[PDB]
């Protein structure tokens, strides 16, 4: 017998002591080396409850990533609080590495292996591990990038205490590549997506949304408003902050068009900080070709709650709350205290 508990985790990684990239530098002084062969014990005939929406591992990862960005980004101007901060801002080397979260003595991590597990409720096939899998701390909005994939079906994750949800996390079972480029106006960029591959996956998403919301017609609309970090697909690439218009990505007449979907993007120097503390300004972009190829592995959505309903549900690309990103990777884990 064991009970739920919260404790301080530590981190492990395969970070390189000679690398100048800032995730590597952070992990070198904050994490230990990865465990050689991590053992996984399967718990016979064990049923266990999980709740990805009340999982203290999520707050602990949020803290680490706040610490990492605080130590390693260098905005020229920081407009946090009510005053300004002026310091140097050289261009940094930036590329997230996988971070494992681990329990100390007297605690263990239980992992849910039901392939179709939605995030909340009983798990019938439980195992114990010492560390999580490697989780890359990718800060993005609207689309989840470089994460893990669901293993069987597409999964719709929502806390469902009410129908009035904040975020709905869609976990894809097939990744879709997104290739973004600022070729050698220096802030003009674009992202390319194989439309045939994307529109088939978006059709399966709709089919599962239909299953989850009482067989109603599923409609996508553009974001209702708010900051550019959420009305655009916002992500970081080689240390530059990209903002891509995803209107053409959620085209209703194209689901139920082939070729390459080219989304217009902009690199911005003046950003709103995802930590939630004011704004910052960075130097203009580096010279040369700026390119990042990423896997779309999930979608962050919002459902309109005040419309006339009977036949249609309307969803809009969302995100902005970065704990949702970590939740889409930690949903399958929970910490227990062994007696």
């Amino acid at each position, epitope marked *: 017998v064991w009970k739920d508990a919260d404790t301080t985790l530590f981190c492990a990684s395969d970070a390189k002591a000679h690398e100048t990239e800032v995730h590597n530098v952070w992990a070198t002084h904050a994490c230990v080396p990865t465990d050689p062969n991590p053992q996984e014990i399967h718990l016979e005939n064990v049923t266990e409850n999980f709740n990805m*929406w*009340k999982n203290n591992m*999520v707050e602990q990862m949020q803290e680490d990533v706040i610490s990492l960005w605080d130590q390693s980004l260098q905005p020229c101007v920081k407009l946090t609080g009510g005053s300004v901060i002026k310091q140097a801002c050289p261009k940094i080397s930036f590329d997230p590495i996988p971070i494992h979260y681990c329990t100390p003595a007297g605690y263990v991590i239980l992992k849910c292996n039901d392939k179709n597990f939605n995030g909340t409720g009983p798990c019938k096939n439980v195992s114990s591990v010492q560390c999580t899998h490697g989780i890359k701390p990718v800060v993005s909005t609207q689309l989840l990038l470089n994460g893990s994939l669901a293993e069987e079906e597409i999964i719709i994750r*929502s*806390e*469902n*205490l*009410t*129908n*009035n*949800a*904040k*975020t709905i996390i869609v976990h894809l079972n097939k990744s879709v590549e997104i290739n973004c480029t600022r070729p050698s106006d220096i802030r003009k960029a674009y992202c390319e997506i194989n439309g045939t591959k994307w529109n088939k996956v978006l059709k399966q998403v709709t089919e599962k949304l239909k299953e989850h919301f009482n067989n109603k017609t599923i409609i996508f609309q553009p*974001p*209702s*408003g*708010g*900051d550019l*970090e*959420i009305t655009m697909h916002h992500f970081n690439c080689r240390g530059e902050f990209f903002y891509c218009n995803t209107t053409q990505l959620f085209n209703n007449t194209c689901i139920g068009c082939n070729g390459t979907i080219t989304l217009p993007c902009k690199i911005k120097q003046i950003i*709103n900080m995802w930590q*939630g503390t*004011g704004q910052a300004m960075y130097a203009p972009p580096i010279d040369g070709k700026i390119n990042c190829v990423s896997n779309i592995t999930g979608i962050l959505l*919002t459902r*309109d*709650g*005040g*419309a*006339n*309903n009977t036949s249609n549900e309307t969803f809009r690309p*969302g995100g*902005g*709350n970065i*704990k949702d990103n970590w*939740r889409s990777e930690l949903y399958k884990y929970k910490v227990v205290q062994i007696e």
Partner: antibody
Amino acid sequence: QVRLAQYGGGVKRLGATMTLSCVASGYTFNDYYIHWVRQAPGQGFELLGYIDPANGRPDYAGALRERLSFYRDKSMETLYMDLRSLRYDDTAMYYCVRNVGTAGSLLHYDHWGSGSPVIVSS
Amino acid sequence: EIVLTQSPATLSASPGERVTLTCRASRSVRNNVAWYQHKGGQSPRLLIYDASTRAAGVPARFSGSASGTEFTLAISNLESEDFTVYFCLQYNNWWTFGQGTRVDIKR
């Protein structure tokens, strides 16, 4: 300790645009959604929609969506609401209201603002 | 859109008595219901949420309960300040409100 101080009410002309504001203080501003609800004379309350102050995402009642806008000044902890093309039946007491949430859901209201009386008459 | 029907519109009561106000939902709202007091000249104030959980600072004579789609606020010992307007809220599917019940002096 929590205050939602409201401004902007009074006599609005018929067909005009009004803008209501709401100065929040006494709590962590980013952690709570803010709802705009009104009560016309003799009627129960009605939600017009809400805004997430962290990123500014609005959601709107479907019948009024086209005439509403919710936005905010994060630096100044101030929330704003516009209602366009004012009509006689937009006369009402307008309230900004703090909404309790959890990691994934929005729930009840726990603090109501001081209220803005709006009278639509030219 | 969920409809909350509050009954009655006006409740006759006497100081010191026990009073019950009902709110029937047009379909299931789980236990996502709250009750508010609305004194004249002031903004509404939270009394009970989640059907039955008394908010912080509410006096003990207020309690709430539920039964399928019916929800009940009880005021066990009516003080003078309590003869006023109460309304319910459901927050299971958007947010909608009952019309309000006024508690008045019985004669």
